[PDB]
Design a protein around this ligand. Structure first.
Ligand SMILES: CC1(N)CCN(c2cnc3c(-c4cccc(Cl)c4Cl)n[nH]c3n2)CC1
Length: 494
Protein backbone atom coordinates (compact mmCIF):
# COMPACT_ATOMS: atom_id res chain seq x y z
CA UNK A 1 0.00 0.00 0.00
CA UNK A 2 2.99 2.28 0.73
CA UNK A 3 1.25 4.71 3.07
CA UNK A 4 4.34 4.60 5.32
CA UNK A 5 6.26 6.95 3.00
CA UNK A 6 6.00 10.63 3.94
CA UNK A 7 7.15 12.73 0.95
CA UNK A 8 7.45 16.22 2.51
CA UNK A 9 8.47 15.79 6.15
CA UNK A 10 11.54 16.85 8.12
CA UNK A 11 13.70 14.58 10.24
CA UNK A 12 12.42 16.05 13.50
CA UNK A 13 8.76 15.95 12.42
CA UNK A 14 9.16 12.22 11.78
CA UNK A 15 10.62 11.95 15.29
CA UNK A 16 7.64 13.65 16.96
CA UNK A 17 5.24 11.68 14.76
CA UNK A 18 6.67 8.31 15.79
CA UNK A 19 6.86 9.37 19.44
CA UNK A 20 3.32 10.78 19.76
CA UNK A 21 1.16 8.76 17.31
CA UNK A 22 3.31 5.63 17.21
CA UNK A 23 4.51 2.80 19.42
CA UNK A 24 7.67 0.73 19.40
CA UNK A 25 7.58 -1.12 16.09
CA UNK A 26 6.19 1.88 14.21
CA UNK A 27 8.19 3.06 11.22
CA UNK A 28 8.06 5.45 8.30
CA UNK A 29 10.13 6.43 5.27
CA UNK A 30 10.99 9.89 4.02
CA UNK A 31 13.38 11.59 1.61
CA UNK A 32 15.86 14.31 2.52
CA UNK A 33 14.37 17.19 0.54
CA UNK A 34 17.65 18.99 -0.24
CA UNK A 35 19.74 15.86 -0.89
CA UNK A 36 18.01 13.84 -3.65
CA UNK A 37 18.55 10.11 -3.48
CA UNK A 38 18.80 10.45 0.32
CA UNK A 39 16.19 8.46 2.25
CA UNK A 40 15.72 7.58 5.92
CA UNK A 41 13.92 4.61 7.47
CA UNK A 42 12.74 6.12 10.77
CA UNK A 43 11.87 3.29 13.18
CA UNK A 44 10.65 3.65 16.75
CA UNK A 45 11.92 1.08 19.24
CA UNK A 46 12.80 0.96 22.94
CA UNK A 47 11.02 4.25 23.55
CA UNK A 48 13.40 5.98 21.12
CA UNK A 49 13.89 6.57 17.39
CA UNK A 50 16.30 4.77 15.06
CA UNK A 51 17.17 6.43 11.74
CA UNK A 52 18.49 4.03 9.10
CA UNK A 53 20.08 5.75 6.10
CA UNK A 54 19.29 4.73 2.52
CA UNK A 55 21.16 6.05 -0.51
CA UNK A 56 20.29 5.76 -4.21
CA UNK A 57 23.11 6.91 -6.50
CA UNK A 58 21.27 5.55 -9.54
CA UNK A 59 21.56 1.75 -9.42
CA UNK A 60 19.82 0.54 -6.23
CA UNK A 61 18.50 1.58 -2.83
CA UNK A 62 21.57 1.03 -0.65
CA UNK A 63 20.58 0.61 3.00
CA UNK A 64 23.55 1.46 5.22
CA UNK A 65 24.55 -1.64 7.17
CA UNK A 66 22.02 -3.81 5.35
CA UNK A 67 21.31 -4.92 1.78
CA UNK A 68 20.50 -3.33 -1.58
CA UNK A 69 16.95 -3.22 -2.96
CA UNK A 70 15.12 -2.26 -6.14
CA UNK A 71 12.30 -0.24 -4.54
CA UNK A 72 11.38 1.05 -1.10
CA UNK A 73 8.26 -1.14 -1.15
CA UNK A 74 10.43 -4.24 -1.63
CA UNK A 75 12.83 -3.01 1.07
CA UNK A 76 10.10 -2.50 3.68
CA UNK A 77 8.39 -5.76 2.68
CA UNK A 78 11.64 -7.75 2.88
CA UNK A 79 12.37 -6.81 6.50
CA UNK A 80 8.78 -7.17 7.72
CA UNK A 81 8.84 -10.80 6.53
CA UNK A 82 12.56 -11.57 7.01
CA UNK A 83 12.84 -10.36 10.58
CA UNK A 84 16.34 -10.53 12.00
CA UNK A 85 18.44 -8.91 9.27
CA UNK A 86 17.78 -5.25 10.15
CA UNK A 87 20.15 -4.87 13.09
CA UNK A 88 21.19 -1.92 15.26
CA UNK A 89 24.85 -1.87 14.14
CA UNK A 90 25.79 -3.10 17.64
CA UNK A 91 23.97 -6.45 17.35
CA UNK A 92 20.51 -5.32 18.51
CA UNK A 93 17.60 -5.97 16.14
CA UNK A 94 15.20 -3.51 14.48
CA UNK A 95 11.55 -4.54 14.17
CA UNK A 96 9.26 -3.10 11.48
CA UNK A 97 5.74 -3.74 12.77
CA UNK A 98 3.29 -0.85 12.31
CA UNK A 99 3.41 1.37 9.19
CA UNK A 100 2.75 4.93 10.31
CA UNK A 101 0.43 6.17 7.56
CA UNK A 102 0.97 9.55 5.90
CA UNK A 103 -1.88 12.01 5.36
CA UNK A 104 -0.31 14.04 2.54
CA UNK A 105 -2.33 13.62 -0.69
CA UNK A 106 0.44 15.20 -2.81
CA UNK A 107 1.83 11.95 -4.25
CA UNK A 108 -1.66 10.79 -5.33
CA UNK A 109 -2.55 10.50 -9.01
CA UNK A 110 -5.99 12.10 -8.55
CA UNK A 111 -5.05 15.09 -6.36
CA UNK A 112 -4.53 18.28 -8.37
CA UNK A 113 -4.08 20.76 -5.53
CA UNK A 114 -4.44 24.45 -6.38
CA UNK A 115 -6.65 23.95 -9.43
CA UNK A 116 -9.72 26.00 -10.29
CA UNK A 117 -13.22 24.69 -10.95
CA UNK A 118 -13.34 25.80 -14.58
CA UNK A 119 -10.00 24.22 -15.48
CA UNK A 120 -11.11 21.01 -13.76
CA UNK A 121 -14.35 20.87 -15.76
CA UNK A 122 -12.48 21.54 -19.02
CA UNK A 123 -9.91 18.77 -18.51
CA UNK A 124 -12.60 16.28 -17.49
CA UNK A 125 -14.75 17.43 -20.42
CA UNK A 126 -11.80 16.89 -22.77
CA UNK A 127 -9.70 14.01 -21.45
CA UNK A 128 -11.99 12.34 -18.93
CA UNK A 129 -13.86 9.11 -19.60
CA UNK A 130 -16.49 7.36 -17.50
CA UNK A 131 -15.23 7.21 -13.92
CA UNK A 132 -12.40 9.71 -14.39
CA UNK A 133 -12.17 11.82 -11.24
CA UNK A 134 -10.00 14.44 -9.58
CA UNK A 135 -9.79 16.24 -6.23
CA UNK A 136 -8.86 19.93 -6.14
CA UNK A 137 -8.46 22.61 -3.50
CA UNK A 138 -11.69 24.48 -2.92
CA UNK A 139 -12.46 27.54 -5.02
CA UNK A 140 -14.74 29.09 -2.38
CA UNK A 141 -13.95 27.87 1.14
CA UNK A 142 -10.24 27.82 2.10
CA UNK A 143 -9.25 24.40 3.41
CA UNK A 144 -12.05 22.41 1.74
CA UNK A 145 -11.84 20.21 -1.36
CA UNK A 146 -14.00 19.26 -4.34
CA UNK A 147 -14.28 15.80 -5.89
CA UNK A 148 -15.03 16.20 -9.60
CA UNK A 149 -16.19 12.99 -11.29
CA UNK A 150 -17.31 12.35 -14.86
CA UNK A 151 -20.10 9.88 -15.63
CA UNK A 152 -21.83 8.81 -18.82
CA UNK A 153 -20.85 6.83 -21.91
CA UNK A 154 -18.11 7.51 -24.45
CA UNK A 155 -19.79 14.77 -26.44
CA UNK A 156 -23.37 15.31 -27.60
CA UNK A 157 -25.91 14.22 -25.00
CA UNK A 158 -25.68 12.29 -21.74
CA UNK A 159 -22.33 12.59 -20.02
CA UNK A 160 -21.89 14.85 -17.02
CA UNK A 161 -19.42 16.10 -14.41
CA UNK A 162 -20.69 15.95 -10.83
CA UNK A 163 -18.99 18.13 -8.20
CA UNK A 164 -18.95 16.73 -4.65
CA UNK A 165 -17.97 18.97 -1.75
CA UNK A 166 -15.34 17.54 0.60
CA UNK A 167 -15.38 19.38 3.92
CA UNK A 168 -12.29 19.35 6.13
CA UNK A 169 -13.16 20.15 9.76
CA UNK A 170 -10.57 19.67 12.53
CA UNK A 171 -8.35 17.43 10.35
CA UNK A 172 -11.15 15.06 9.28
CA UNK A 173 -12.68 14.81 5.80
CA UNK A 174 -16.25 14.01 4.77
CA UNK A 175 -18.69 14.52 1.91
CA UNK A 176 -21.08 16.44 4.14
CA UNK A 177 -22.51 13.37 5.88
CA UNK A 178 -21.69 9.91 7.20
CA UNK A 179 -18.14 8.89 8.06
CA UNK A 180 -15.33 11.35 8.77
CA UNK A 181 -11.96 10.21 7.42
CA UNK A 182 -8.47 10.90 8.72
CA UNK A 183 -7.09 11.77 5.27
CA UNK A 184 -8.18 12.64 1.76
CA UNK A 185 -6.74 9.31 0.62
CA UNK A 186 -8.88 7.31 3.05
CA UNK A 187 -11.94 9.24 1.86
CA UNK A 188 -11.20 8.57 -1.81
CA UNK A 189 -10.42 4.89 -1.24
CA UNK A 190 -13.66 4.43 0.71
CA UNK A 191 -15.85 5.88 -2.04
CA UNK A 192 -13.63 4.16 -4.60
CA UNK A 193 -14.96 0.84 -3.26
CA UNK A 194 -18.40 2.03 -2.01
CA UNK A 195 -19.27 4.67 -4.63
CA UNK A 196 -21.71 7.46 -3.88
CA UNK A 197 -25.20 7.04 -5.32
CA UNK A 198 -27.14 10.12 -6.39
CA UNK A 199 -30.71 10.64 -5.23
CA UNK A 200 -32.11 9.64 -8.66
CA UNK A 201 -29.87 6.67 -9.40
CA UNK A 202 -26.55 7.72 -10.94
CA UNK A 203 -23.53 6.12 -9.25
CA UNK A 204 -20.57 8.47 -8.74
CA UNK A 205 -18.03 5.79 -9.60
CA UNK A 206 -14.35 6.56 -8.95
CA UNK A 207 -12.66 4.46 -11.64
CA UNK A 208 -9.32 5.95 -12.69
CA UNK A 209 -7.65 9.31 -12.04
CA UNK A 210 -7.75 11.96 -14.74
CA UNK A 211 -4.64 11.54 -16.90
CA UNK A 212 -2.47 14.67 -16.84
CA UNK A 213 0.89 13.19 -17.89
CA UNK A 214 0.19 12.29 -21.52
CA UNK A 215 1.49 15.10 -23.70
CA UNK A 216 1.99 15.73 -27.36
CA UNK A 217 5.63 14.98 -28.09
CA UNK A 218 5.81 18.19 -30.16
CA UNK A 219 5.13 20.22 -26.99
CA UNK A 220 7.69 18.35 -24.87
CA UNK A 221 9.64 21.58 -24.34
CA UNK A 222 6.54 23.22 -22.82
CA UNK A 223 6.08 20.43 -20.27
CA UNK A 224 9.78 20.42 -19.33
CA UNK A 225 9.29 24.16 -18.78
CA UNK A 226 6.58 23.70 -16.15
CA UNK A 227 8.12 20.66 -14.46
CA UNK A 228 11.11 22.91 -13.63
CA UNK A 229 9.57 25.69 -11.52
CA UNK A 230 8.68 21.23 -7.98
CA UNK A 231 6.94 19.73 -11.01
CA UNK A 232 9.54 17.06 -11.78
CA UNK A 233 9.86 15.89 -8.17
CA UNK A 234 6.13 15.81 -7.41
CA UNK A 235 5.45 13.95 -10.66
CA UNK A 236 8.17 11.37 -9.95
CA UNK A 237 7.14 10.57 -6.38
CA UNK A 238 3.54 10.18 -7.54
CA UNK A 239 5.06 7.52 -9.80
CA UNK A 240 6.97 6.01 -6.87
CA UNK A 241 3.81 5.85 -4.76
CA UNK A 242 2.30 3.43 -7.30
CA UNK A 243 5.15 0.91 -6.92
CA UNK A 244 3.20 -0.83 -4.14
CA UNK A 245 1.04 -2.44 -6.84
CA UNK A 246 4.14 -4.08 -8.38
CA UNK A 247 5.05 -6.63 -5.69
CA UNK A 248 4.91 -9.58 -8.08
CA UNK A 249 6.46 -12.89 -7.07
CA UNK A 250 10.20 -13.58 -7.26
CA UNK A 251 10.26 -17.19 -6.10
CA UNK A 252 12.84 -18.42 -8.62
CA UNK A 253 15.38 -15.73 -7.77
CA UNK A 254 14.90 -16.49 -4.06
CA UNK A 255 15.61 -20.21 -4.41
CA UNK A 256 18.90 -21.13 -2.97
CA UNK A 257 20.45 -22.98 -5.94
CA UNK A 258 20.00 -19.56 -7.62
CA UNK A 259 21.21 -17.19 -4.88
CA UNK A 260 24.80 -17.14 -6.19
CA UNK A 261 23.54 -16.30 -9.71
CA UNK A 262 22.35 -12.88 -8.50
CA UNK A 263 24.83 -10.02 -8.21
CA UNK A 264 22.67 -8.36 -5.54
CA UNK A 265 20.83 -10.69 -3.19
CA UNK A 266 17.49 -8.86 -3.00
CA UNK A 267 17.29 -7.57 -6.60
CA UNK A 268 15.52 -10.43 -8.36
CA UNK A 269 13.62 -10.96 -11.63
CA UNK A 270 9.84 -11.18 -11.64
CA UNK A 271 8.65 -14.74 -12.15
CA UNK A 272 6.20 -13.81 -14.93
CA UNK A 273 8.80 -12.00 -17.09
CA UNK A 274 12.04 -13.81 -16.20
CA UNK A 275 14.13 -15.35 -18.97
CA UNK A 276 14.12 -19.16 -18.79
CA UNK A 277 17.18 -20.99 -20.13
CA UNK A 278 17.18 -24.31 -21.97
CA UNK A 279 19.73 -25.05 -15.09
CA UNK A 280 17.18 -22.46 -16.22
CA UNK A 281 17.79 -19.39 -14.06
CA UNK A 282 19.36 -16.09 -15.06
CA UNK A 283 18.77 -12.70 -13.44
CA UNK A 284 17.09 -11.31 -16.55
CA UNK A 285 13.63 -10.07 -17.53
CA UNK A 286 11.88 -9.89 -20.89
CA UNK A 287 10.72 -6.30 -21.43
CA UNK A 288 7.86 -5.86 -23.90
CA UNK A 289 6.27 -2.50 -24.90
CA UNK A 290 8.88 -5.33 -33.64
CA UNK A 291 11.25 -4.61 -30.72
CA UNK A 292 11.58 -6.20 -27.28
CA UNK A 293 14.36 -6.07 -24.68
CA UNK A 294 16.12 -8.25 -22.12
CA UNK A 295 16.98 -6.27 -18.99
CA UNK A 296 19.56 -8.13 -16.93
CA UNK A 297 22.35 -7.75 -14.40
CA UNK A 298 26.05 -7.40 -15.08
CA UNK A 299 27.53 -10.88 -15.31
CA UNK A 300 29.21 -12.54 -12.38
CA UNK A 301 32.10 -14.92 -12.97
CA UNK A 302 29.79 -17.90 -12.37
CA UNK A 303 27.03 -16.63 -14.71
CA UNK A 304 29.05 -15.77 -17.83
CA UNK A 305 28.11 -19.07 -19.47
CA UNK A 306 24.44 -18.64 -18.55
CA UNK A 307 24.53 -15.14 -20.07
CA UNK A 308 25.73 -16.46 -23.44
CA UNK A 309 23.14 -19.23 -23.30
CA UNK A 310 20.47 -16.53 -23.03
CA UNK A 311 21.90 -14.42 -25.86
CA UNK A 312 21.90 -17.51 -28.08
CA UNK A 313 18.48 -18.86 -27.08
CA UNK A 314 16.80 -15.48 -27.66
CA UNK A 315 18.52 -14.91 -31.06
CA UNK A 316 19.79 -11.57 -29.76
CA UNK A 317 22.14 -9.71 -32.09
CA UNK A 318 22.71 -6.49 -30.10
CA UNK A 319 24.03 -6.09 -26.55
CA UNK A 320 23.93 -2.74 -24.73
CA UNK A 321 26.42 -2.40 -21.87
CA UNK A 322 25.85 0.83 -19.92
CA UNK A 323 28.58 0.38 -17.31
CA UNK A 324 32.30 0.02 -16.87
CA UNK A 325 33.74 -3.22 -15.52
CA UNK A 326 34.77 -1.35 -12.35
CA UNK A 327 32.99 1.72 -10.99
CA UNK A 328 33.15 3.36 -7.55
CA UNK A 329 36.02 1.03 -6.67
CA UNK A 330 33.82 -2.08 -6.97
CA UNK A 331 33.30 -4.65 -9.71
CA UNK A 332 30.01 -4.03 -11.52
CA UNK A 333 30.24 -6.62 -14.33
CA UNK A 334 32.63 -9.40 -15.34
CA UNK A 335 34.43 -9.13 -18.68
CA UNK A 336 32.35 -11.69 -20.60
CA UNK A 337 33.83 -10.97 -24.05
CA UNK A 338 37.21 -12.16 -25.39
CA UNK A 339 40.06 -9.87 -26.35
CA UNK A 340 40.09 -8.47 -29.88
CA UNK A 341 40.79 -11.03 -32.65
CA UNK A 342 40.65 -13.75 -29.96
CA UNK A 343 38.38 -16.79 -29.77
CA UNK A 344 37.07 -18.09 -26.45
CA UNK A 345 34.58 -20.70 -25.27
CA UNK A 346 32.02 -19.95 -22.54
CA UNK A 347 30.55 -23.36 -21.76
CA UNK A 348 28.78 -24.80 -24.80
CA UNK A 349 29.07 -21.40 -26.47
CA UNK A 350 31.86 -19.89 -28.56
CA UNK A 351 32.48 -16.17 -29.12
CA UNK A 352 35.03 -14.56 -31.45
CA UNK A 353 35.90 -10.88 -31.01
CA UNK A 354 36.06 -10.00 -34.70
CA UNK A 355 36.79 -6.27 -34.52
CA UNK A 356 36.55 -3.44 -31.99
CA UNK A 357 35.65 0.10 -33.07
CA UNK A 358 36.23 2.94 -30.62
CA UNK A 359 33.97 6.00 -30.65
CA UNK A 360 33.96 9.10 -28.46
CA UNK A 361 31.22 7.84 -26.13
CA UNK A 362 31.33 4.07 -26.62
CA UNK A 363 33.24 1.03 -27.85
CA UNK A 364 31.71 -1.19 -30.54
CA UNK A 365 32.66 -4.88 -30.55
CA UNK A 366 31.65 -7.09 -33.47
CA UNK A 367 31.35 -10.55 -31.89
CA UNK A 368 30.66 -13.89 -33.63
CA UNK A 369 28.55 -16.18 -31.47
CA UNK A 370 28.32 -19.91 -32.12
CA UNK A 371 27.36 -23.11 -30.31
CA UNK A 372 30.00 -25.85 -29.99
CA UNK A 373 29.03 -29.00 -31.90
CA UNK A 374 26.43 -27.50 -34.31
CA UNK A 375 28.41 -26.77 -37.48
CA UNK A 376 26.94 -23.48 -38.64
CA UNK A 377 25.22 -21.60 -35.78
CA UNK A 378 27.45 -18.48 -36.03
CA UNK A 379 25.65 -15.10 -35.78
CA UNK A 380 27.09 -11.59 -35.40
CA UNK A 381 26.25 -10.13 -31.98
CA UNK A 382 27.11 -6.43 -31.75
CA UNK A 383 28.13 -5.24 -28.28
CA UNK A 384 27.68 -1.51 -27.71
CA UNK A 385 29.64 -0.59 -24.57
CA UNK A 386 28.84 2.90 -23.28
CA UNK A 387 31.78 4.17 -21.24
CA UNK A 388 31.21 7.90 -20.64
CA UNK A 389 28.34 7.39 -18.17
CA UNK A 390 29.47 8.82 -14.80
CA UNK A 391 29.60 6.93 -11.53
CA UNK A 392 26.93 9.05 -9.82
CA UNK A 393 24.06 10.98 -11.33
CA UNK A 394 23.18 11.20 -15.01
CA UNK A 395 24.97 12.76 -18.00
CA UNK A 396 24.56 16.53 -18.05
CA UNK A 397 23.76 16.50 -21.79
CA UNK A 398 21.82 13.69 -23.53
CA UNK A 399 23.61 14.07 -26.88
CA UNK A 400 25.99 11.16 -26.40
CA UNK A 401 23.29 8.74 -25.25
CA UNK A 402 20.92 9.71 -28.07
CA UNK A 403 23.60 9.16 -30.74
CA UNK A 404 24.66 5.94 -29.01
CA UNK A 405 20.97 4.96 -28.96
CA UNK A 406 20.44 5.94 -32.60
CA UNK A 407 23.31 3.67 -33.65
CA UNK A 408 21.89 0.69 -31.73
CA UNK A 409 18.44 1.12 -33.30
CA UNK A 410 19.92 1.17 -36.82
CA UNK A 411 21.92 -1.96 -36.00
CA UNK A 412 18.88 -3.82 -34.64
CA UNK A 413 16.80 -2.98 -37.72
CA UNK A 414 19.55 -4.07 -40.14
CA UNK A 415 19.30 -7.68 -38.92
CA UNK A 416 16.21 -9.55 -40.09
CA UNK A 417 14.26 -11.26 -37.29
CA UNK A 418 16.83 -10.32 -34.65
CA UNK A 419 15.81 -11.17 -31.09
CA UNK A 420 15.47 -8.84 -28.11
CA UNK A 421 18.05 -6.16 -27.36
CA UNK A 422 20.12 -7.13 -24.31
CA UNK A 423 20.57 -4.19 -21.92
CA UNK A 424 22.54 -4.44 -18.70
CA UNK A 425 24.41 -2.33 -16.17
CA UNK A 426 25.22 -3.39 -12.59
CA UNK A 427 21.87 -4.34 -11.04
CA UNK A 428 20.08 -3.99 -14.37
CA UNK A 429 17.29 -1.67 -13.20
CA UNK A 430 18.67 1.87 -13.05
CA UNK A 431 20.75 2.81 -16.09
CA UNK A 432 19.28 -0.23 -17.85
CA UNK A 433 15.78 1.05 -17.16
CA UNK A 434 16.66 4.62 -18.10
CA UNK A 435 18.05 3.39 -21.43
CA UNK A 436 15.13 1.12 -22.36
CA UNK A 437 12.54 3.78 -21.46
CA UNK A 438 14.26 6.41 -23.61
CA UNK A 439 14.44 3.96 -26.53
CA UNK A 440 10.78 2.97 -26.07
CA UNK A 441 9.68 6.61 -26.16
CA UNK A 442 11.85 7.41 -29.19
CA UNK A 443 10.61 4.37 -31.13
CA UNK A 444 7.10 5.81 -30.81
CA UNK A 445 8.21 9.25 -32.01
CA UNK A 446 10.36 8.08 -34.94
CA UNK A 447 7.39 6.11 -36.31
CA UNK A 448 4.20 8.16 -35.83
CA UNK A 449 5.73 11.63 -36.16
CA UNK A 450 6.67 14.33 -33.69
CA UNK A 451 3.05 15.30 -32.97
CA UNK A 452 2.32 11.95 -31.29
CA UNK A 453 1.12 11.05 -27.79
CA UNK A 454 3.72 10.12 -25.17
CA UNK A 455 3.19 9.37 -21.47
CA UNK A 456 6.49 9.16 -19.57
CA UNK A 457 5.16 7.88 -16.20
CA UNK A 458 2.68 5.45 -17.78
CA UNK A 459 5.55 4.08 -19.89
CA UNK A 460 7.83 3.65 -16.87
CA UNK A 461 5.13 1.97 -14.76
CA UNK A 462 4.45 -0.41 -17.65
CA UNK A 463 8.17 -1.32 -17.76
CA UNK A 464 8.35 -1.56 -13.95
CA UNK A 465 5.70 -4.29 -13.99
CA UNK A 466 8.14 -6.44 -16.00
CA UNK A 467 11.25 -5.79 -13.87
CA UNK A 468 11.53 -4.31 -10.38
CA UNK A 469 12.52 -0.68 -10.02
CA UNK A 470 13.19 0.16 -13.67
CA UNK A 471 14.46 3.76 -13.63
CA UNK A 472 15.87 4.32 -10.14
CA UNK A 473 16.18 8.04 -9.35
CA UNK A 474 14.51 11.34 -10.13
CA UNK A 475 17.76 12.41 -11.82
CA UNK A 476 17.21 9.57 -14.29
CA UNK A 477 13.52 10.46 -14.61
CA UNK A 478 14.47 14.06 -15.40
CA UNK A 479 17.11 12.80 -17.84
CA UNK A 480 14.47 10.79 -19.71
CA UNK A 481 12.48 13.98 -20.32
CA UNK A 482 15.62 15.89 -21.36
CA UNK A 483 16.69 13.12 -23.75
CA UNK A 484 13.30 12.98 -25.47
CA UNK A 485 13.23 16.77 -25.80
CA UNK A 486 16.73 16.86 -27.32
CA UNK A 487 15.73 14.14 -29.80
CA UNK A 488 12.59 16.13 -30.65
CA UNK A 489 14.72 19.19 -31.41
CA UNK A 490 17.27 17.47 -33.67
CA UNK A 491 14.67 16.11 -36.11
CA UNK A 492 12.64 19.31 -36.45
CA UNK A 493 15.84 21.33 -36.66
CA UNK A 494 16.59 19.02 -39.60
C1 LIG B 1 -0.39 17.29 -8.89
C2 LIG B 1 0.01 15.83 -8.79
N1 LIG B 1 0.03 15.45 -7.25
C3 LIG B 1 1.39 15.54 -9.37
C4 LIG B 1 1.36 15.63 -10.92
N2 LIG B 1 0.31 14.80 -11.57
C5 LIG B 1 0.65 13.41 -11.93
C6 LIG B 1 -0.30 12.57 -12.64
N3 LIG B 1 -0.11 11.30 -13.03
C7 LIG B 1 1.07 10.67 -12.76
C8 LIG B 1 1.69 9.34 -13.00
C9 LIG B 1 1.12 8.05 -13.71
C10 LIG B 1 0.55 7.99 -15.01
C11 LIG B 1 0.03 6.83 -15.62
C12 LIG B 1 0.05 5.59 -14.97
C13 LIG B 1 0.61 5.61 -13.69
CL1 LIG B 1 0.64 4.09 -12.87
C14 LIG B 1 1.11 6.78 -13.11
CL2 LIG B 1 1.76 6.63 -11.54
N4 LIG B 1 2.92 9.40 -12.44
N5 LIG B 1 3.08 10.65 -11.92
C15 LIG B 1 2.05 11.51 -12.04
N6 LIG B 1 1.84 12.81 -11.65
C16 LIG B 1 -1.01 15.16 -10.98
C17 LIG B 1 -1.06 14.97 -9.46
Amino acid sequence: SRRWFHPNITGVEAENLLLTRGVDGSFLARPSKSNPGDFTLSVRRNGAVTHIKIQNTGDYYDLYGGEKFATLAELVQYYMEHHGQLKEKNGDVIELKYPLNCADPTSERWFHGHLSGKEAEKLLTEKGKHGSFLVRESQSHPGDFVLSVRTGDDNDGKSKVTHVMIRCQELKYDVGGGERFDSLTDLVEHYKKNPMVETLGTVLQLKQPLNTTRINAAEIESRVRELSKQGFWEEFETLQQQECKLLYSRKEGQRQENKNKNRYKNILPFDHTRVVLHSDYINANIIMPKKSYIATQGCLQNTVNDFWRMVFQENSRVIVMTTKEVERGKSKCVKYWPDEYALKEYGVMRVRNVKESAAHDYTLRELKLSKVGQGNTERTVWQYHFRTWPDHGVPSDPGGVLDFLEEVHHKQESIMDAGPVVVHCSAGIGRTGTFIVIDILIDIIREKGVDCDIDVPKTIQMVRSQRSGMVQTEAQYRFIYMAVQHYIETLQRR
